[PDB]
Structures are given as structure tokens and as C-alpha cells.
């Protein structure tokens, strides 16, 4: 089916988990999980394998799949 | 902490303001 789900881990090693479609423009995802922290989104950084995840990256772009990870530093 | 798992959401004429 279509929703992949992708591992969001924190500086603190916690975990929120996010599914999106292949499609989904990954700011929707990086504003939500700042809201979940009470934090500006734009204080954070999202990585992939260590690359900047941009607001208009999809994770067909980024080659995602299934419980792959992004992991959020502080900007 | 338990499971976390948040669905992002897909990105008028009944309008008043």
C-alpha cells in the first residue's frame, strides 16, 4: 500500500514516527514534528543519511522506503 | 514512551469571512 512510515529520531534518541505517501513534500512532516517539540521549525535541521531534507523533498525524491530514518539536529 | 505514529495529510464557495 501506499503510506511509507519513516522514523523521525530526536537529539534526545526519542522517536516519532510520521506516514507519509511517496508524493508528500517533506515540510508538511518537518512542521509537524516541531509543533509536537514546541519548537520553531526553522531552529532544526532534518537529515537523511546525513543530507539536508528540503521543504519541497518527497521521499520518492530521496529514495526513501518503509522505516527509514530522518534524524533532526538543531540548525 | 509508547508508539508515536502522526499521518501527514494530503496538501471555499461556503466561505463568510
Same mark, same amino acid.
Given at each position: 500500500?501506499? #503510506?511509507?512510515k =519513516?522514523?523521525?529520531?530526536?537529539?534526545?534518541?526519542?522517536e516519532?514516527?510520521?506516514? @507519509? %505517501?511517496?508524493?508528500?513534500? =517533506?515540510? %508538511?512532516?518537518?512542521?509537524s #514534528?516541531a509543533?509536537?517539540?514546541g @519548537?520553531?521549525?526553522?531552529?532544526?535541521?532534518?537529515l537523511?543519511?546525513?543530507?539536508?531534507?528540503?521543504?519541497?523533498?518527497?521521499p520518492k525524491e =530521496?529514495?526513501?522506503? *518503509? *522505516?527509514? @530514518?530522518?534524524e @533532526? #539536529?538543531?540548525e | 514512551?509508547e508508539?508515536?505514529?502522526?499521518?501527514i495529510?494530503?496538501?471555499?464557495?461556503?466561505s463568510r469571512?
Amino acid at each position: 500500500g501506499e #503510506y511509507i512510515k =519513516l522514523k523521525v529520531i530526536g537529539q534526545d534518541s526519542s522517536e516519532i514516527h510520521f506516514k @507519509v %505517501k511517496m508524493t508528500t513534500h =517533506l515540510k %508538511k512532516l518537518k512542521e509537524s #514534528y516541531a509543533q509536537r517539540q514546541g @519548537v520553531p521549525m526553522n531552529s532544526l535541521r532534518f537529515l537523511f543519511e546525513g543530507q539536508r531534507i528540503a521543504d519541497n523533498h518527497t521521499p520518492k525524491e =530521496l529514495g526513501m522506503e *518503509e *522505516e527509514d @530514518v530522518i534524524e @533532526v #539536529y538543531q540548525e | 514512551a509508547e508508539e508515536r505514529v502522526v499521518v501527514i495529510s494530503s496538501s471555499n464557495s461556503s466561505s463568510r469571512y
